[PDB]
């Protein structure tokens, strides 16, 4: 069972024990840590952060004491601008420079493979993903030929229905790809209006669900049925959770509310908060278990918040499993508790302790 665990380079700048750098992640956590992001200019895989190569030796020493960790390095991400990326993989020159920078600068920096993170194509992508995927693997076969461990390649995927069809060709790209990170999470925006859990398990109550698509379990399977080998698929858990500001004295599921939650004091965003956040959150709240869901939400004044926990990771780890899935991916290393001070236990990384132990269970 694969952990992939994704570390997110911007945490270094969060304040006080906010701040995260990869010399404080568990070596021996996960099987596979991906850093994110880097950037892509003149059509050549670059860094992003000023201090990338001083983060990327960084992570990678964490190797030293244990060789089967495998690294990966993704490229895209939010701030990236699904625009450029197109251009690039549309264009057959770009597209050609950028592929055949990779290996170099992979082996340049010791990681052991890409990871794309193109968030996210648009309908009019569908085949430029397909190609650039098929042609990216051709060449880490190539470059690998002469006899070197060859450079794995992966991708993070929506896990929405709309984004699934109109940008994805599963059957194809599964074949290329050595594993693919499904992005189930985000399943309820606060533009929705109301309350409701951003990574539930199930659909749960029938009656009150805005989407019949929005959650892990339909995600998973749809993915399964449009091609996607159940030993290449890896699904995504989230050690952050989203927010939202209550207008009324309603706090259960689809209650209404005027927006997202109040930021959280280290990652400074509305609608987001990290689960170390939360722990600090959960002093004096309420937890309910959704019912239907397999998970929990925590509501404290004005605030609700929908998220992950031990016992929740745990079922969802229970539910791949019993799917026979490749593993488990984890967004993200900085938004556990990596410090173990918030959630007290002083146990570091809690979610996702919680997950690799589940892994390994029974
Ligand atoms: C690429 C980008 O927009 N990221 C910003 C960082 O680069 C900023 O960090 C500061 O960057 C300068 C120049 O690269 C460094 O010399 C400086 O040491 C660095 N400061 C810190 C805190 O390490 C960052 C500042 O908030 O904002 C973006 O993340
Ligand atoms: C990633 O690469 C892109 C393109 O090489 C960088 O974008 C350029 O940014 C400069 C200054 O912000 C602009 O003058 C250019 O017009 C941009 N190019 C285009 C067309 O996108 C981007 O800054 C890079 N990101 C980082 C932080 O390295």
Not at 105 to 126: M, V
Request: glycine share 8%; net charge positive.
């Amino acid at each position: 069972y694969k952990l992939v665990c994704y570390y997110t380079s911007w945490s270094q700048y969060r304040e006080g024990d906010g701040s995260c750098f990869p010399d404080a992640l568990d070596r021996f956590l996960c099987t596979h840590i991906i850093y994110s992001f880097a950037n892509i200019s003149n059509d050549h895989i670059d860094t992003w952060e000023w201090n990338d190569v001083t983060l990327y030796g960084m992570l990678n020493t964490l190797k030293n004491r244990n060789p089967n960790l495998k690294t990966l390095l993704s490229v895209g991400g939010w701030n990236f601008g699904s625009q450029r990326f197109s251009k690039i993989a549309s264009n057959t020159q770009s597209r050609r420079t950028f592929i055949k920078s990779v290996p170099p600068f992979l082996r340049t920096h010791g990681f052991d493979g890409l990871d794309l993170a193109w968030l996210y194509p648009g309908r009019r992508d569908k085949q430029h993903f397909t190609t650039l995927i098929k042609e990216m693997k051709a060449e880490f076969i190539k470059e690998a030929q002469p006899g070197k461990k060859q450079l794995l390649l992966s991708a993070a995927l929506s896990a929405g229905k709309v984004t699934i069809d109109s940008s994805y060709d599963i059957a194809k790209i599964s074949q290329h790809l050595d594993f693919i990170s499904i992005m189930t999470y985000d399943f309820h925006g606060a533009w929705r209006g109301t309350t409701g859990h951003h990574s539930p398990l199930f659909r749960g109550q029938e009656d009150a669900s805005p989407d019949r698509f929005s959650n892990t379990d339909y995600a998973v399977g749809y993915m399964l049925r449009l091609g996607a080998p159940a030993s290449k698929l890896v699904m995504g858990i989230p050690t952050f959770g989203r927010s939202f500001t209550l207008a009324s004295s309603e706090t259960g599921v689809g209650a209404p509310i005027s927006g997202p939650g109040i930021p959280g004091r280290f990652t400074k965003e509305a609608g987001t908060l990290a689960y170390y956040e939360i722990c600090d959150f959960l002093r004096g709240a309420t937890v309910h278990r959704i019912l239907g869901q397999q998970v929990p939400y925590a509501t404290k004044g004005n605030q609700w918040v929908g998220y992950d926990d031990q016992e929740s990771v745990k079922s969802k780890v229970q539910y791949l499993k019993d799917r026979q899935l490749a593993g488990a991916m984890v967004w993200a290393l900085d938004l556990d508790d990596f410090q173990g001070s918030f959630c007290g236990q002083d146990l570091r990384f809690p979610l996702t302790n919680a997950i690799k132990d589940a892994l390994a269970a029974t």
